UniProtKB/Swiss-Prot annotation:
It comes from Homo sapiens. The record marks 24-25 as: Reactive bond. Residues 6-44 form the Kazal-like domain. Disulfide bonds join 8-44, 22-41. The gene is SPINK5. This is Hemofiltrate peptide HF6478. It comes from the Eukaryota. The chain holds residues 23 to 77 of 1064 of the full protein.
Amino acid sequence: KNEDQEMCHEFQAFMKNGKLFCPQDKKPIQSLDGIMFINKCATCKMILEKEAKSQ
């Protein structure tokens, strides 16, 4: 949902060269994609690429 994009926000700044450098967050989050926190990297990555389509 739109809320899932918020998790990509913090992972968006860690994104570089079109890559998601998702760091280890001391506070674990529960993803809805079926992953634990790690989803931010698997979700934000696909969410950070969508912005590249605007190019």
